[model samples]
Target: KETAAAKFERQHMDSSTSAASSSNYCNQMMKSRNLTKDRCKPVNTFVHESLADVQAVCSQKNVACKNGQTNCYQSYSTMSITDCRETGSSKYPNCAYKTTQANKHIIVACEGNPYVPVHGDASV
Candidate 1:
């Protein structure tokens, strides 16, 4: 049988045709893990977004979301939520942030031994 990651990649290759396509990778991982649903809860994982991207969002938006210090956004995979306030900082400091424009996109990070998926519902 194929690994969950591989199965996910096969299902959505268009999202991961590049080396730095972290969001695409995350989306695939989520699909493989069966985390892409309308009401499923987000499993707090270490490999979400990176510190740099988090800081960029906070700096750009002038918010307080930080690495390992704030909470990240989480929701049912299909939910149309758009409030990326920080939930944790130590592991996911820059995990979430508000967008500059109403429909702006957010970049997420995917990390682990084999890699995983992360994405904003808006982009899906």
Candidate 2:
């Protein structure tokens, strides 16, 4: 029989598997859609074993992680931080926008099993 720890590891790994690829997909989509700097910016991608983990990572990055919010540009559990606003929402807060500075691209890597990619409007 699979040990509890093994099962837990497998479950957690599965949850984190798609994070990097999802970010890549989002980036490709932006490029294909010709989304300009005026329209949107490519924020960092994140991966984590759990939502708490994502928050911890964000805290380390010095990004603001809000509580009790959804629809965050990126989030892993209940914790989230805004990247850019595609639309407005009371539940979701917007990230600070800087017109003079260039946007930075980051990818958060999580150790886990690989995840399958799903196609969407944002995915090519």
Candidate 3:
């Protein structure tokens, strides 16, 4: 079984790929990351920073999460990232996505012994 920290990495971390904001990036990534397995994830994001940098976020100042959790933290510096938005025509087994790039401070929820990112909450 995979931990939430591992799943977060698979879903959002793209550090080694550099800055690639192609439209197809989301389309291919969503599928490859298994986000489109049963239902299309309406919205998702990919962080273009090193895993270590992202991991350090867990130790940053804690912030409030969307679900009212206090385990979330916001990055101190802005980082390159890509957003994936599902189109209206998107359907299961054939998910489609639109990609957009931006530089923002990423927010993530942390948990466990090492306090790693378990969920990407937002990018401000």
Candidate 4:
């Protein structure tokens, strides 16, 4: 059984490599991660920080999730991340994306005991 945290990792984690600068990074990654399988994810973010570091955010400053949930936490330090946005020309089965890389603080919604990231809230 895959937990939401694990699902979040499968969709958003990219810690081992820093090749996000490539123009085709989003086009390739979006498909490989299956984000473009059913439909292109309109927007998504990939975190380059280690899983340990990201998991630790669960204990960071608490914040409100977009839905007004109180389980969200913000990272204490800025981290390397890549934003993927669907290109206007993109369509299902042909999901195209524009990649923008940056260093920013990320917010995530955590849950369960030994809480971990269940949702990527935003980057600040």
Q: How high is the lDDT of residue 81 in model 2?
A: 21
> What's the number of clashes in each of the models?
19, 0, 0, 0
Better model by lDDT: candidate 2 vs candidate 3:
3
Q: Please report, in order, the local distance difference test score of every candidate based on alpha carbons.
A: 0.30, 0.28, 0.89, 0.90
Task: Give lDDT tens digits, candidate 1, residues 1-124.
Answer: 8764454333322322223223333433434545444422233122223333322332232212234322223221221112222223312322332211122233232333433432221231
Which parts of model 2 are misplaced by more than 4 Å?
A: 1-24, 28-38, 56-124
Q: lDDT winner between 1 and 3, please give it.
A: 3
**Per-residue C-alpha lDDT of model 3 across residues 8-119, encoded as one tens digit per residue:** 9999999977665577999988888888887999999999999999999998878999999999999999989999999878887778888888888999999998889999
TM-score of 2: 0.21
RMSD of each: 14.4, 14.6, 1.2, 1.2
Quality of model 4 by C-alpha lDDT: 0.90
As a whole number from 0 to 100, the lDDT of residue 91 in candidate 2 is 23
Instruction: Mark the regions of model 3 whose C-alpha exceeds 4 Å error after superposition.
Output: none
Would you estimate the TM-scores of all the predictions? 0.21, 0.21, 0.93, 0.94
Task: Give the poorly placed runs of model 1, Cα more than 4 Å off.
Answer: 15-111, 118-124
Which residue window of length 10 is worst by lDDT in model 1? 75-84
The CA lDDT at 34 in model 3 is: 89
Residue 98, model 3, lDDT:
85
